Structure formats: structure tokens, C-alpha cells
Amino acid sequence: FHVRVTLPPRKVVDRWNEKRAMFGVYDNIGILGNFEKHPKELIKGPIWLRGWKGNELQRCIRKKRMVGNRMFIDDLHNLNKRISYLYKHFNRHGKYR
Amino acid sequence: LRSRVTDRYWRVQEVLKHARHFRGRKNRCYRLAVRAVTRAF
């Protein structure tokens, strides 16, 4: 349970760096922008996750549908097994029925 | 985001301080000590 004996270098975060100061700037782009672009368009990330959300099962299911054929073998296989496991679990196990 | 318990040291000390004056291994080992302290109270 031994705890480090030396004070860590104090990390100084400047809150006024570019990325922090400009944060959430275009979030209202639809309302103020005479709706053309929905705020979804501002989402950077995985192709299957842009402007969408779901529990792990739905997530995997969707990843497979979208990018499934671009996947590496091991990863596709793992994805399938994951799906089968989650399917079995959510549908057949739990307290609440 | 992995979270580990950093302060576990003090968690242990708040038990062990009550056990110092016991005889045997009860005064050292958190397991035995926790039990003995509870019985003490």
C-alpha cells in the first residue's frame, strides 16, 4: 500500500489554450444558422458512431453492419463472438425478465 | 478510465491504530486486526 515518496511535477493546465477557449463554438449552428447543418455534422469519430448512440449490443451490431467487410479477420471474428455473447446474455439472463 | 485506490494506506491505519496494543499477529495483519478490533469495540 506504499505511496510515492516524492511530489509529482505540478502539472499546469492553461485553460486558455486554443482548444479549450474555442470549445463548443458551433454547437448552435442549426438554430443560428438557418437550419442547414444539424450539430451532428460537428461530430468527429468512428464512422458508425457519428450522431448515434446505443447499448453495447446495438453498438456492435451496427459496427458489423457498417464496416464489417473492411475489418481484419481476427477482429471480425471477435466481433461476431462478442455479438453472440451479448445476444445470449441480454435476451436470456438477468433479474428482471 | 481506470481508477485505483491510492490512499489505501490510511484506510488501513484507521483500523490498525486500535490494534497496536494487542498480543500476537492481531496487532499487525490487517485481516486478523480488523476482526479483533471489531470485537474490541
Binding site: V3, R4, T6, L7, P8 | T6, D7, Y9, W10
Partner: peptide, 26 residues
């Protein structure tokens, strides 16, 4: 290694206490 200031600081206090227990200041 565990990431945080808090426990380190809090321990620095203990170090000081022991230092004062082993050599008491005049």
C-alpha cells in the same frame, strides 16, 4: 505508479511527522 497529487501530498505530511518524531526540534 498511480496518477494523482493527493495521496503524495498527504504522505509528505506523514514524512514530516516522522522526521519530527525521530529528531525533535529544539
Amino acid at each position: 505508479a498511480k496518477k494523482g497529487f493527493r495521496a503524495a501530498y498527504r504522505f509528505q505530511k506523514e514524512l514530516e511527522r516522522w522526521r519530527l518524531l525521530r529528531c525533535p526540534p529544539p
